[PDB]
């Protein structure tokens, strides 16, 4: 039980992430409302076996968000500043618009590209070997939405849900090459992910509490599924099961579509502290880690729901075909 309260008693967890280079390493970001404390902005690092408090941190009075790590291995750290700028730090070392999203594009030959979606929608991208990083390199793409999801197999293509109620798609060759919109349910979508399995399946979730299986091969979505709290964070589970999860108000609603229908497979309120914030599952153990709106951290383990091990694994492509069948049924 590692319930971290380093300072963050008056902070609010904005993001939680894990490290592939160190599978036992996790980095969290929070935003503070009380300035009468240690410092401003947040990036905290710690391992699973290390002391509850964050082992390593970065100290400054700079509010920092849009955090991501070097793609090959944890050697460089990138952050998208609140004023549209971008900063990069050597890990092996001691604008009228904010940036919304950030991503590394791994080019193994050299440094790895940087893409930042701003709060207006427009996308920027660049990379430079000198990391003291100079934003002089830059490219701009005419982008309308805020959270841009990229195509796992073909990283140049991307999509987004816009406030106008559509879901735009395009790619890196031209920002205007392919400017149609996904219209599965045609709602103001603010979240997108991709099924981390065989297909080119992605998901997009709207302000109207609607979740949408964008199969890249289709213009009409597969399973127009539907549930309160779909504005907020969604995720594909790091299991063979295509498990879905939404989480607000110290409450998580969980879907295991691999064993049951689109009704919620589990739901859990948490009394540790109110208003759960960002979460993290690791593939290794079901020690699920979560933050709270009070800035604290916690974790629990429910191993019986780990895996079903027969239907999730090779029947999952059949399950996606079955979802397309459910579309033919909708028709």
């Amino acid at each position: 039980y590692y319930w971290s309260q380093g300072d963050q008693r008056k902070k609010n967890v904005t993001s939680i992430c894990w490290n592939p280079l160190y599978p036992d390493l996790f980095a969290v970001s929070l935003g503070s409302y009380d300035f009468t404390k240690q410092r401003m902005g947040l990036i905290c690092l710690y391992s699973l076996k290390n002391t509850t408090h964050p082992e390593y941190a970065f100290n400054c009075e700079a509010g920092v968000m849009c955090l991501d790590f070097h793609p090959k291995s944890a050697a460089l750290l990138a952050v998208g500043l609140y004023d549209g700028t971008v900063l990069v730090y050597d890990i092996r070392n001691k604008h009228t618009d904010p940036v919304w999203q950030v991503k590394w594009n791994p080019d193994t030959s050299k440094n790895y590209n940087f893409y930042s979606i701003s709060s207006d929608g427009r996308v920027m991208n660049w990379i430079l070997m000198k990391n003291k990083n100079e934003e002089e390199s830059t490219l701009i793409g005419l982008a309308c939405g805020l959270c841009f999801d990229f195509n796992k197999f073909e990283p140049h293509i991307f999509l987004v849900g816009t406030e106008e109620g559509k879901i735009h798609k395009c790619s890196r060759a031209y920002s205007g090459q392919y400017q149609e919109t996904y219209n599965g349910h045609l709602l103001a979508v603010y979240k997108v992910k991709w099924n981390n399995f065989h297909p080119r399946t992605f998901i997009s979730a709207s302000a109207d509490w609607t979740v949408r299986i964008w199969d890249s091969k289709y213009t009409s979505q597969i399973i127009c599924f539907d549930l309160s709290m779909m504005v907020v964070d969604a995720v594909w589970a790091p299991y063979s099961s295509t498990v879905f999860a939404c989480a607000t108000m110290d409450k998580v609603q969980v879907y295991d579509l691999n064993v049951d229908k689109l009704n919620k497979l589990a739901e859990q309120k948490i009394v540790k502290q109110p208003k759960l914030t960002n979460l993290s599952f690791n593939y290794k153990d079901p020690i699920l880690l979560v933050g709270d709106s009070h800035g604290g951290v916690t974790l629990v383990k429910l191993s019986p729901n780990l895996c079903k091990s027969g239907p999730e694994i090779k029947q999952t492509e059949d399950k996606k075909a079955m979802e397309e069948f459910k579309n033919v049924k909708i028709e």
């Binding site: 060759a173 031209y174 090459q177 392919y178």
Partner: protein, 145 residues
């Protein structure tokens, strides 16, 4: 024909996008006028394809604006001493080798050639815009100069 076009336009345009990225590389590669113009005289056979004219017609405006500054910078160098050394039509004779009028005339010859070089380029395509209106606006002024 239109499936032909759906596929071909998209792909040929993705290739025009390499061509447009190298229009960007035009400046992205060099810091000096004739490095840039090495790369510009590089793109001569480019003028037979009306697929570059898109990003050209796009990039031409900002390119014209940048080039106009350099010509005005040359005029400012001619009439006023620059920061790294005093350069003027008067040409303060600190040292004398040939007639002072002679040295000043050599300086003015170098500068007028530097001025004529970009002007001819703009009437063209690989280094110009085929005489658009903005070109005429820049051209009256720098012709007077």
């Amino acid at each position: 024909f239109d499936d032909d076009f759906y596929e071909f336009r998209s792909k040929i345009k993705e290739l025009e996008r390499r061509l447009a990225s190298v229009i960007t590389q035009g400046f992205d590669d060099y810091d000096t006028i004739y490095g840039r113009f090495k790369l510009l005289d590089n793109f001569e056979g480019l003028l037979t394809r009306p697929i570059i004219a898109d990003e050209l017609e796009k990039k031409h405006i900002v390119l014209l604006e940048m080039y106009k500054q350099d010509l005005k910078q040359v005029q400012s160098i001619f009439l006023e001493g620059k920061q790294f050394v005093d350069s003027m039509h008067e040409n303060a004779p600190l040292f004398l080798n040939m007639p002072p009028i002679a040295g000043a005339l050599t300086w003015c010859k170098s500068l007028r050639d530097r001025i004529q070089e970009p002007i001819e380029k703009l009437a063209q395509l690989g280094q110009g815009i085929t005489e658009r209106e903005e070109y005429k606006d820049v051209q009256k002024l720098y012709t007077s100069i």
